[PDB]
Design an enzyme around this catalytic site. Sequence first.
Site, short mmCIF file in Angstrom:
data_model
loop_
_atom_site.label_atom_id
_atom_site.label_comp_id
_atom_site.label_asym_id
_atom_site.label_seq_id
_atom_site.Cartn_x
_atom_site.Cartn_y
_atom_site.Cartn_z
N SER A 139 0.79 -1.22 0.00
CA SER A 139 0.00 0.00 0.00
C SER A 139 0.83 1.28 0.00
O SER A 139 0.37 2.29 -0.55
CB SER A 139 -0.97 0.00 1.20
N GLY A 199 -1.58 -4.66 1.13
CA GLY A 199 -1.54 -5.93 1.83
C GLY A 199 -0.48 -6.92 1.36
O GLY A 199 -0.31 -7.98 1.99
N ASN A 201 4.35 -5.78 5.75
CA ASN A 201 3.26 -6.70 5.96
C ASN A 201 3.59 -8.17 6.10
O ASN A 201 2.63 -8.96 6.23
CB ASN A 201 2.28 -6.63 4.76
N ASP A 235 -3.36 6.51 10.31
CA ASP A 235 -3.59 5.37 11.20
C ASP A 235 -2.31 4.80 11.73
O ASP A 235 -2.18 3.63 12.12
CB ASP A 235 -4.39 4.30 10.44
N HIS A 271 -0.18 4.01 7.37
CA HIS A 271 -0.35 4.62 6.05
C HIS A 271 -0.11 6.13 6.11
O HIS A 271 -0.54 6.84 7.01
CB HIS A 271 -1.73 4.28 5.48
#
Lengths: 212, 212
Positions: free
Chosen positions: B43, B70, B100, B188, B191
């Site tokens: 991402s 992801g 990830n 968050d 990101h």
Amino acid sequence: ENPASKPTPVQDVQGDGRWMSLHHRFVADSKDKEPEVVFIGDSAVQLMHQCEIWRELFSPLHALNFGIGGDSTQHVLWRLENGELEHIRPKIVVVWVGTNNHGHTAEQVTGGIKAIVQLVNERQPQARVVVLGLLPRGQHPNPLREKNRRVNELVRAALAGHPRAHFLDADPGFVHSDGTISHHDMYDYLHLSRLGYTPVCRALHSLLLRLL
Amino acid sequence: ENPASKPTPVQDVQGDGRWMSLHHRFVADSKDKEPEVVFIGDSAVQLMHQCEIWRELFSPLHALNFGIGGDSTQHVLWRLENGELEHIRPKIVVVWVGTNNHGHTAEQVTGGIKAIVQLVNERQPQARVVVLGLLPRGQHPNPLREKNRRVNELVRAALAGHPRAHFLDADPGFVHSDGTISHHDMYDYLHLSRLGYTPVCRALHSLLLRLL
């Protein structure tokens, strides 16, 4: 138990605690501010704050955005029970959640959405509740499109007799006549681009002004 | 097998097929275009196309963006082996992946990143390879910060003797002296916001112009 309406936090299986950091930030927001409108739901709410412009249409209305990417109905219910509705007295709460409830039937997701509306009616009984329809997803026709359609049918019929609860279909026609969704509207066929957000937020803003 | 360097697609356990729709779109992009620079990763690459402005800095360089939210190292390796490097002859490939890979040790993630660089060196041997450092994450100090730090150490030392492979630390100092990351940089705490992307992309663009 309907799994979708049993309140529970997102367990951290990764180790940086970000979900609980977001919840604690929203709790402090409610302690310190006095919103007229509260938004809560999954990434469709969260990214509207970044990636539509929130600022033109929703900031003027005195609004807080409590979207968290990945949330299901039961995680939203838990957050509203555990601090994010304290110390405030909004006129309107906007709910947008359910597309991520994988492994729950459409009927179970509907029960989840209804339990959110009931909690908001108990804790903040002066507020109108707006629930948005679940959007289509996937580049081509698929079973989650039919699932999300059935949820919207069941939720619309549940709210129809609800004097201060409002269902809104904000979909302008993302699915075209050849069955496709275009990556210009949804860059990964689920999350909305800037362009995809404009007509959604337009429809929401109009309803909000009408209610307000 | 290192799990991180065994190539495999993302299995669809949800039912709308979006991962494979994205891969097929990128395959058609490579069939039909002639990029000078190809970007691939998770991402952090994908949202740079939306949410930084790609258009000011990277569109001029004749660039394709193959980010998918992801993805781990092994999913990126699979996509590069299964169509996304066909029919093209880029000067530069930019790789940004690894945050990830949950359940893999820092050593395994490093092996994943090295297998991506080797594949690009085999299939597109004229191209320089840029690898970006894994960013800090989480609002407060946590074990994934230390993991990602160790990956960057091992990857930097692996690439140091590599005439046409370049490690870039693009982090301007997101972690402050009280240990915190601010939601103004990462909404968050993972990101990047628009504001968070500016200095990252600035650092990348400068390196790219230098190499080009």
